[model samples]
Target: SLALSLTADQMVSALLDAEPPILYSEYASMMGLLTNLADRELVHMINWAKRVPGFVDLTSHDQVHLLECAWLEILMIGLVWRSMEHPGKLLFAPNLLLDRNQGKCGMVEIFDMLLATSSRFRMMNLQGEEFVCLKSIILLNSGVYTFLSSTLKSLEEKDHIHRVLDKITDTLIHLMAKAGLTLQQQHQRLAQLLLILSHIRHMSNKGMEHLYNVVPSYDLLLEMLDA
Candidate 1:
């Protein structure tokens, strides 16, 4: 599997070394080819993770590395999807994303893909108990929704964004409570989720105020509730 073949060291090195030339026009064709190959290769990497038994076992450091590699692939996919003008085919399976080919679309498709991948790559303990990775991924995804919703509401003169942020926050808190962690453990995960939430909140605050508008936040994030 490509995922298993690429060591963490290799990944980190490649990411660090990828640099654009001063005259990027000269490298446009090369860059495009590289980008496409990277995206397709990532899909293969993720597929490999699904078939590897120890991919989700965090008890061993090596096993955790495999899971992390899989996650890196997903992060790359998300970045590519976000950049596409017409993201129709790339957002779901059988096209450079997952292999399931469910044919779902848009935010729902992205959300479902993330959840399914998280579930498949979730780490487990010695006792076969799944760890907090699944919950963490869910919270992270939800936080994206909250940030986008809040921003849109402020811009569109609708209260939808705030409502969505509130709902997402509520769901995050509920998940944290039932994650079978001690207060300290819960706090650790919650802190990570909060950091992501704060980022979204900052974007929403700025976007709503019309202070140098940029990315349009996700449209469906209108029903999220805060904690």
Candidate 2:
């Protein structure tokens, strides 16, 4: 039942026609409902796990899978909230099947959404641990990073593009540091995150004068840093 419910073909199509602004509004409503359900389900799962005497002995894979599901749900909720907040700027391509090859939004647009969502979670003081954990997964998830890198590569200003990546990496590092992860562990994670950033930087500098218009240079990035 859970698998069937989660299957994109079965569940995501209902929102295909509701792209952009309207989709944002509809998704916001759906997100509220789903958030409540997730809260109840998480509580139930915790109670069930506690009842199992050997639950603590579960394999690392099992533990990671459980955490992944919960964290992904939370991340999806955050994405939905972000889309709703900036309906005009944030594009939601629900045609998961056909739209898989298309860019969902422009680079700056994507960056804004990411930053805004991150800020919202920070300000709300909610799920700090889970946020950090999910962020780790996101950094490690090659597909997510690749998509973001591709969008960043599309930007015209190389420096601006670099700054965006730099900001994102710095934000993630800062958050992980605050979560009390050891410097070595944080460094390891930062290296993985920078892999994506570096790839974007490389792509932006590759004979694409058009991209220079879109991405900011190192000096401009410094200006942003100073500000």
Candidate 3:
């Protein structure tokens, strides 16, 4: 059996489909609409997570825990990916574009962070395969282990996840090679992709902190927020 078989186009539609809707008539409050958007997208992300290679190997509890811990970062990855070409604005959904000025009172700082991330993506000219795999890495990366509680606490589980990470990276490198990049080019590209995950950690925390102050309608959103 193949360890991994994901592609950029496959994940791209997953992201676009999961983008939550926002009505112009209901758009008086950005924070209000954002919370709604987050809740809807969170559902879609969980569904997407379940389909990721090795994701189901974890206990159901750990699955939820991973989603809770990294939801904001995962969300940021999608946001930045979509907004890469636009600059200074986020294409949160096909219909829900937001500018820095639109961020206004509650979202100004968060919007700035998102814009900066989009700039990084643009700078790299990130490919679809890279974005899809990087998004998976953000969900399953080693750094997320620090937030572990009762779940994913065993050494065996940690090793299992570590192996999963290796499989994903291997698949990514293989994809790059298939695209005709030289070995050294693939190595540098992998290094660069991994490097951005650290930056996402910072942005994720900032987003969590910002959302902490806002009221969320969905219980799951609140649950993930506190994790």
Candidate maximizing lDDT: 3
Regions of model 1 farther than 4 Å from truth: 1-30, 34-158, 183-188, 196-227
Per-residue lDDT tens digits for candidate 1, residues 167-205, read 434444455566567767656654654453334333334
Candidate 2 regions with alpha-carbon error over 4 angstroms: 1-156, 191-227
Tens digits of per-residue lDDT, candidate 3, 69-171, equal: 6778887888898899798899877667889888787568878878988998899788876777788788887344664555434555567677777777776
Q: Once model 3 is optimally superposed onto the true structure by TM-score, how far is the C-alpha of residue 68 displaced, in angstroms?
A: 1.1
lDDT (CA) per prediction? 0.33, 0.36, 0.70
lDDT of 2: 0.36
Error of 2 at 79 (Å): 5.8
> Quick one: ranking by TM-score, best first?
3, 1, 2
C-alpha TM-score for every candidate? 0.26, 0.23, 0.79
Decide which is better by TM-score, 1 or 2.
1
lDDT of 1 at 31: 31
Model 3: runs farther than 4 Å from truth?
Answer: 1-27, 142-144, 147-153, 213-227
lDDT of 3 at 52: 71
